[PDB]
């Protein structure tokens, strides 16, 4: 009873204005460390089941270490960037002399500390697993040399349990060339993660946002394998910083709009190409063309500013009056008269053309409405299912009021044959000029004759 939606029959589109923004504007880089134990060399002869298992597990431990040692419409306008450029930058610094030692020094006493590195950047550091103390002090002295007898079997379980976390981490990086996303629990546990969130210099609200949506933060995060110099494993976890919160958001749904004259082809189509998510953020509007990049948790819409264009606030005028002189609304044209449907947040837009059967159904009563060739909309409340031809769409069941804005479909104002129909990222004014050009050429070419 928050989120609402409006359908514009005039432009075959719909806008949902009940959403709140969640923009990633930046990156925070933290350094996670694991103090590791070097081994040389377990030398136990005689194969005892209890001896073989510890050795085998220790062999598993060593191989992990070895593997790590071994590792060392629209949208086309967005441009390119390097997602892990920030994280890689941190990794690079870590490859310096006794920088390891600097950080290895601060984390000896506590498991958490900020160390200023020679780049000058202060970074939160975490020692989450100390296999070293356990392996070097409990395990290693018994194994050397010749006689090794291991009793109390619960010990081999404890070591496999402790070692296990390291093994999944070595496993993941192995299948991701040292960059994983999303960041798994093995890489960084929730307690560790929540602890990480509290020292990040963001708003108490921003911390609040991330903590209720940790599962989202993980998908927008990167874990980057760096170095294993000295006796410490170190990798950098790259977390999103949300500089934009609680600003109004809206999602634009579009569908092909065509004339419904009786002939077979000879039809003209039209489709709005500025579909996607729009959000208010700095007096302008951040527009996200590919709405795959935006995750939704009801009230909150999570987006990454890298795949976006920053547009003027006049962009909203295209939804109410597409012919405004203040903004040239982006569109496409076609002769492709094909039926399809678009499921919106609180309903469904149905582009029905030709002899195609377009229908809406309820789970209980069955078919409840047969569409009359054109762009229409139906609420989510009285409808559960939509079938367009042989393809069946399911409708969203959220709560919220929808508004049908009546208006003559815009495509009907144009005379065929003078209409430009092969336009992919054109616009209103860009269409009008070609018609004008064609209006001039048709009109001037008979005046002379």
């Amino acid at each position: 009873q928050n989120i609402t939606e409006e359908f514009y029959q005039s432009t075959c589109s719909a806008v949902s204005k009940g959403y709140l923004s969640a923009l990633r504007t930046g990156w925070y880089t933290s350094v996670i460390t694991i103090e590791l134990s070097n081994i040389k060399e377990n030398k136990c002869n005689g194969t005892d089941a209890k001896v073989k298992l510890i050795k085998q597990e220790l062999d598993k431990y060593k191989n992990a270490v070895t593997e790590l040692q071994l590792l060392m419409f629209l949208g086309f306008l967005l441009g390119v960037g390097s997602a892990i450029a920030s994280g890689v930058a941190v990794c690079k610094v870590l490859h310096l002399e006794g920088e390891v030692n600097k950080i290895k020094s601060a984390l000896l006493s506590t498991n958490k500390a900020v160390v200023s590195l020679s780049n000058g950047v202060s970074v939160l550091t975490f020692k989450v697993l100390d296999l070293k103390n356990y392996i070097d002090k409990q395990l290693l002295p018994i194994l050397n040399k010749q006689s090794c007898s291991i009793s109390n079997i619960e010990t081999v379980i404890e070591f496999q349990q402790k070692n296990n976390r390291l093994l999944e981490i070595t496993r993941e990086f192995s299948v991701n060339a040292g960059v994983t996303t999303p960041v798994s629990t093995y890489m960084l546990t929730n307690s560790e993660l929540l602890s990480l969130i509290n020292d990040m210099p963001i708003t108490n609200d921003q911390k609040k946002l991330m903590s209720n949506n940790v599962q989202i933060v993980r998908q927008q995060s990167y874990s980057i394998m760096c170095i294993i110099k000295e006796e410490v494993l170190a990798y950098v976890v790259q977390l999103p910083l949300y500089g934009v919160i609680d600003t109004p958001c809206w999602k634009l749904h579009t569908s092909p709009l065509c004339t419904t004259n009786t002939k077979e082809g000879s039809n003209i189509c039209l489709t709005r190409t500025d579909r996607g998510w729009y959000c208010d953020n700095a007096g302008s509007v951040s527009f996200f063309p590919q709405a795959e990049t935006c995750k939704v948790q009801s009230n909150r819409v999570f987006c990454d500013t890298m795949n976006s264009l920053t547009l003027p606030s006049e962009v909203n005028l295209c939804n109410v009056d597409i012919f405004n002189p203040k903004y040239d609304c982006k569109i496409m044209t076609s002769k492709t008269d094909v039926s399809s449907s678009v499921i919106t947040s609180l309903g469904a837009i149905v582009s029905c053309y030709g002899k195609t059967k377009c229908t809406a159904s309820n789970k209980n009563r069955g078919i409840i409405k047969t569409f009359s060739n054109g762009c229409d909309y139906v609420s989510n409340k009285g409808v559960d299912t939509v079938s367009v031809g042989n393809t069946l769409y399911y409708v969203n069941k959220q709560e919220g009021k929808s508004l049908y804005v009546k208006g003559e479909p815009i495509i009907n104002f144009y005379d065929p044959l003078v209409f430009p129909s092969d336009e992919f990222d054109a616009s209103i004014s860009q269409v009008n000029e070609k018609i004008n050009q064609s209006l001039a050429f048709i009109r001037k070419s008979d005046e002379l004759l």
């Epitope: 958490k112 020292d199 708003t203 609200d205 903590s211 209720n212 919160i245």
Partner: antibody, heavy 120, light 107 residues
């Protein structure tokens, strides 16, 4: 259910130091995400936030009565302690202790309280 | 530090009359939170996340607002509602409370 309870001398002489012991159950202060905060209410006056502390030992204090505040914890005894130096009868009031979470920055559970009196 | 104002500081209403409480803050904030307090008894949390109902709380209560303006609404003022109501925010330190709203019965 979470339950918290305040303790502390009911009377305290001016300039002396005021120590308060908040004890609780139903939840560990060591568990990730967990916090305890102090809040006071002067007679016939609005509630005033005082201090808090988290499982990661982060501490915060209200600048108005700064630097007179000291907060510490002991997850072993399930209690949090707050100290206030140089008391003034302005501070005569009823204090509450309450839990906080990082998931939700508000005080969901409340001690029934202890009050403190300041006078010679 | 942010500072909260609250109105009306004193209000009274008959059983069943609608009741509206408005909170004003010096800086924009994420969420407004609301507490009920009886005399001498420890304060109780009423509404959280601006409009979300806490447990034990009546659907009679509701929340709404954004930016620096938030409102609490009692759909039908019932005797058990006699209390002082405080607006709160944990959005930025130091935390603040409302100037405080005292309700009774008009007229």
């Amino acid at each position: 259910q979470v339950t918290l309870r305040e303790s502390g001398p009911a009377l305290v002489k001016p300039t002396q130091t005021l120590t308060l012991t908040c004890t609780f159950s139903g939840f560990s202060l060591s568990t990730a995400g967990m916090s305890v905060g102090w809040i006071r209410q002067p007679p016939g006056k609005a509630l005033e936030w005082l201090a808090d502390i988290w499982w990661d030992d982060k501490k915060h204090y209200n600048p108005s009565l700064k630097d007179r505040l000291t907060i510490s914890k002991d997850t072993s005894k399930n209690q949090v302690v707050l100290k206030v130096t140089n008391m003034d009868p302005a501070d005569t009031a009823t204090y509450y202790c309450a839990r906080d979470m990082i998931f939700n920055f508000y005080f969901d559970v409340w001690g029934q309280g202890t009050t403190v009196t300041v006078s010679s | 530090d942010i500072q909260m104002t609250q109105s009306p500081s004193t209000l009274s209403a008959s059983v069943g009359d609608r009741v509206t409480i408005t909170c004003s803050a010096s800086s924009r904030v994420g969420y407004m939170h609301w507490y009920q307090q009886k005399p001498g008894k420890a304060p109780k949390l009423l509404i959280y996340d601006t409009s979300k109902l806490a447990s034990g709380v009546p659907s009679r209560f509701s929340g709404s607002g954004s930016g620096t303006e938030f409102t609490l609404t009692i759909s039908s003022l019932q005797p058990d509602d006699f209390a002082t109501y405080y607006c709160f925010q944990g959005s930025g330190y130091p935390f603040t409370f409302g100037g405080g709203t005292k309700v009774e019965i008009k007229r």
